[PDB]
Scaffold this active site. Structure first.
Site, PDB file in Angstrom:
ATOM      1  N   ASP A   1      36.683  38.125  52.154  1.00 42.28           N
ATOM      2  CA  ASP A   1      38.054  37.686  52.400  1.00 42.28           C
ATOM      3  C   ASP A   1      39.069  38.729  51.962  1.00 42.28           C
ATOM      4  O   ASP A   1      40.070  38.408  51.331  1.00 42.28           O
ATOM      5  CB  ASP A   1      38.354  36.348  51.730  1.00 42.28           C
ATOM      6  CG  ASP A   1      39.707  35.790  52.138  1.00 42.28           C
ATOM      7  OD1 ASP A   1      40.024  35.818  53.343  1.00 42.28           O
ATOM      8  OD2 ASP A   1      40.460  35.335  51.259  1.00 42.28           O
TER       9      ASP A   1
ATOM     10  N   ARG B   1      46.784  39.327  50.198  1.00 43.12           N
ATOM     11  CA  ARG B   1      46.934  38.251  49.224  1.00 43.12           C
ATOM     12  C   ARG B   1      45.953  38.375  48.064  1.00 43.12           C
ATOM     13  O   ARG B   1      46.245  37.957  46.950  1.00 43.12           O
ATOM     14  CB  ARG B   1      46.721  36.897  49.899  1.00 43.12           C
ATOM     15  CG  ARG B   1      45.444  36.816  50.718  1.00 43.12           C
ATOM     16  CD  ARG B   1      45.189  35.420  51.258  1.00 43.12           C
ATOM     17  NE  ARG B   1      44.075  35.401  52.201  1.00 43.12           N
ATOM     18  CZ  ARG B   1      44.182  35.681  53.494  1.00 43.12           C
ATOM     19  NH1 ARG B   1      45.354  36.000  54.011  1.00 43.12           N
ATOM     20  NH2 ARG B   1      43.113  35.642  54.271  1.00 43.12           N
ATOM     21  N   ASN B   2      44.779  38.927  48.340  1.00 40.86           N
ATOM     22  CA  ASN B   2      43.750  39.101  47.325  1.00 40.86           C
ATOM     23  C   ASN B   2      43.762  40.490  46.691  1.00 40.86           C
ATOM     24  O   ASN B   2      42.744  40.972  46.211  1.00 40.86           O
ATOM     25  CB  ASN B   2      42.371  38.773  47.892  1.00 40.86           C
ATOM     26  CG  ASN B   2      42.188  37.292  48.131  1.00 40.86           C
ATOM     27  OD1 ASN B   2      42.675  36.469  47.363  1.00 40.86           O
ATOM     28  ND2 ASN B   2      41.500  36.946  49.206  1.00 40.86           N
TER      29      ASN B   2
ATOM     30  N   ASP C   1      39.366  38.435  43.221  1.00 42.10           N
ATOM     31  CA  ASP C   1      38.494  37.420  43.821  1.00 42.10           C
ATOM     32  C   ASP C   1      37.308  37.978  44.608  1.00 42.10           C
ATOM     33  O   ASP C   1      36.946  37.440  45.648  1.00 42.10           O
ATOM     34  CB  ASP C   1      39.298  36.460  44.707  1.00 42.10           C
ATOM     35  CG  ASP C   1      40.217  35.549  43.913  1.00 42.10           C
ATOM     36  OD1 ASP C   1      40.184  35.590  42.666  1.00 42.10           O
ATOM     37  OD2 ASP C   1      40.978  34.785  44.542  1.00 42.10           O
TER      38      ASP C   1
END
Ligand SMILES: *S(=O)(=O)c1cc(C(=O)OC[C@H]2O[C@@H](n3cnc4c(N)ncnc43)[C@H](O)[C@@H]2O)ccc1CC
Length: 290
Positions: free
Chosen positions: A149, A153-154, A167
Site C-alpha cells: 500500500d 499517505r503512508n 506501515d
C-alpha cells in the site's frame, strides 16, 4: 502475557504519554516523551510516537500489533523508514515505540506548501523527496519486504524534512480487503494498486514499483488526488483498456517517462527500486533549486 525481550524493553515510568495523534478502528497513536531512551544519555528526553490497542479490542487485534513489532525487529534500521525504538510489554498494556514525524504525512506536507490563490518547495526539493522514498523502498526490498500500500499517505516527514516510509510491517490479510472502503480524506486505495495485484491478487516488488509511479504523480501535482470522481467499477474498465494518467504541469518529460516506465503493463519490464534510486540520484544533481 508477553515474553520479555531485553533488546527493546523500556521501563513504563520512563515514558510520558501525551496528546493523541489519531485513532482508527484497529488502534490509536499518541505523542510521548521518553527519558533515557539511549543508555548513554539517561537524563535527556526524546519525542516519540507510541502505538497501542484501543478499549474494546480483540485477541486478533493484539496479535496483529505484536506481529508488526516483530517484523520491524527483523527488518533492521534505515534512515528513510519509521524505525522501532523500544517497547513496554511487561506488567501492563502493550506499547510499541517508534520514531516521530512532526510534519505529518507526505500528502498533507505537500498540500500545505502549494502556491496561494508560509513555506514553498523548489523543483530540486520535489525530486529529492522522490529520491528519499525510493531509497527507503530499496532497503525494504533488500530485506524481502513487500509494502502492498505504498502511497503519499503512508510516507511521513520529520522535523528536518526527512522522508520515512511507514506501515510497512503491517499485517493485512489478502482477500479480506474492501475495494469500496475509502480513506479518511475520501480517496480509494485501489487507485495505487498494480493491475495484477488488483485482479489476480499477486503482490510483488514489481507491484510496489507500480504504486511508486502513482506516488511520483502525487509529488509532482503537490498532493493531487488520482482519478478524481472515478468509482471502482470505472477504474476497472480504465485499467483493462490501458489507460494512463496525463503528465502533470511543471513536470519534465524525463520524470513523466519514469512514471510511465513504472506503469508498464508487463511486471518484468518495469524498473527496480535499485534502478530508480540511481536515476533519481543523477536527476537531483542536474535539477535547479532556482
Ligand atoms: S493501527 O494499526 O490501527 C494504525 C493506526 C494509525 C493511526 O491511528 O493514525 C492516526 C494518525 O497518526 C499519524 N501517525 C502515525 N504514526 C506516526 C508517527 N510515527 N509520527 C507521527 N504521526 C504518526 C498518522 O499519520 C495519522 O495521521 C496509523 C497506522 C496504523 C497501522 C495500520
Amino acid at each position: 502475557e508477553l515474553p520479555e525481550d531485553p533488546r527493546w524493553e523500556l521501563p513504563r515510568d520512563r515514558l510520558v504519554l501525551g496528546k493523541p495523534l489519531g485513532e482508527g478502528a484497529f488502534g490509536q497513536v499518541v505523542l510521548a516523551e521518553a527519558i533515557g531512551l539511549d543508555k548513554d544519555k539517561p537524563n535527556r528526553v526524546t519525542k516519540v510516537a507510541v502505538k497501542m490497542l484501543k478499549s474494546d479490542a480483540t485477541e486478533k487485534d493484539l496479535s496483529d500489533l505484536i506481529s508488526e513489532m516483530e517484523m520491524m525487529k527483523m527488518i533492521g534500521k534505515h534512515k528513510n523508514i519509521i524505525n522501532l525504538l523500544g517497547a513496554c510489554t511487561q506488567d501492563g498494556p502493550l506499547y510499541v515505540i517508534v520514531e516521530y514525524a512532526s510534519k505529518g504525512n507526505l500528502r498533507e506536507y505537500l498540500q500545505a506548501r502549494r502556491p496561494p490563490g508560509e513555506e514553498q518547495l523548489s523543483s530540486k526539493d520535489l525530486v529529492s523527496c522522490a529520491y528519499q522514498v525510493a531509497r527507503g523502498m530499496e532497503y525494504l526490498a533488500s530485506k524481502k519486504c513487500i509494502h502492498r500500500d505504498l502511497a503519499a499517505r503512508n510516507v511521513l516527514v520529520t522535523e528536518d524534512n526527512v522522508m520515512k516510509i511507514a506501515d510497512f510491517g503491517l499485517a493485512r490479510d489478502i482477500h479480506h480487503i474492501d475495494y469500496y472502503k475509502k480513506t479518511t480524506n475520501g480517496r480509494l486505495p485501489v487507485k495505487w494498486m498494480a493491475p495484477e495485484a488488483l485482479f489476480d491478487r499477486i503482490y510483488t516488488h514489481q507491484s510496489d514499483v507500480w504504486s511508486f509511479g502513482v506516488l511520483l504523480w502525487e509529488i509532482f501535482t503537490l498532493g493531487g488526488s488520482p482519478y478524481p470522481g472515478v468509482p471502482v467499477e470505472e477504474l476497472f474498465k480504465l485499467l483493462k483498456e490501458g489507460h494512463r494518467m496525463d503528465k502533470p504541469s511543471n513536470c519534465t518529460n524525463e520524470l513523466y517517462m519514469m512514471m510511465r516506465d513504472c506503469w508498464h503493463a508487463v511486471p518484468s519490464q518495469r524498473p527496480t527500486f535499485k534502478q530508480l534510486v540511481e536515476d533519481l540520484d543523477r536527476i537531483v544533481a542536474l535539477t535547479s533549486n532556482q
